[PDB]
Structure formats: structure tokens, C-alpha cells
Write a protein that binds this DNA or RNA. Structure first.
Lengths: 57, 49
RNA sequence: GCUUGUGCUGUCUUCGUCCA
């Protein structure tokens, strides 16, 4: 569909980052809280993006 | 009684399942952080599915 | 006049209960 599903949109060029409501953090004990799995995966993705940008230039 | 009754001693044993350890009710209470639905468990004042 | 105290993880695993 030209308006809604264009074929080139199947390739990701910009990634949407969900709000913390989607990936809430949990307090494992009284002091240390735990980052969610999605948060760690997004951190890894962003590190890889930074690495690619640094290497390219 | 018009009917005679079978009558005698028998060995009975009390099992761990008592009603006061199973009765549970909930009007409102804690909810999960991710889904904002009632938590699971009688010990946690949870809801029924 | 000294004025009262509100908040709970999460993920696995196991063992059970009632039907089947």
C-alpha cells in the first residue's frame, strides 16, 4: 500500500525507543535495582551504533 | 432408627489442607508494575484469573 | 497542648491440590 505499507520501510534506518513504561526496572533488593532486558539490549544496540560511527570516520 | 447402622472404630488421618489456609477475597489492592493488573497469589493479596 | 505513623521486586525451579 502506497499510503501505509511501503516496501522500503521493511528496512530499518531509524529505530523507535520505547518509553520506560514498556521496559520497567525492578528493585532486586533494598539498594540495587535491576535494568530490564530491553534496556540492556538497547544499550548494546546503541554501543554498536556508536562503534560503527566511530570506525567509519 | 428403622435401619441399623454399621458402627465401629476406624483409623482416620488429618490432611494438611485446611480451609483457613485457602479462603481468599479481594476488592482492590496491589497491581503489577508492567501490566497494572492484580498481582498473583493469595499471600500477596492477589486477584483471581 | 504534644500529636501518629502507608509500602514491595522479579525470574526460574521444584513439589503439591481439584477436574481430567
Amino acid at each position: 500500500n502506497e499510503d501505509y505499507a511501503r516496501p522500503e520501510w521493511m528496512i530499518i534506518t531509524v529505530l523507535p525507543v520505547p518509553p520506560p513504561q514498556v521496559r520497567p526496572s525492578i528493585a532486586m533488593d533494598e539498594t540495587t535495582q535491576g535494568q530490564d532486558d530491553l534496556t540492556h539490549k538497547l544499550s548494546d544496540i546503541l554501543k554498536a551504533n556508536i562503534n560503527v560511527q566511530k570506525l567509519e570516520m | 432408627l428403622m435401619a441399623q447402622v454399621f458402627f465401629g472404630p476406624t483409623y482416620y488421618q488429618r490432611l494438611r489442607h485446611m480451609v483457613d489456609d485457602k479462603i481468599h477475597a479481594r476488592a482492590r489492592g496491589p497491581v503489577q508494575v508492567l501490566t497494572r493488573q492484580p498481582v498473583e497469589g493469595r499471600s500477596r493479596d492477589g486477584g483471581l484469573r
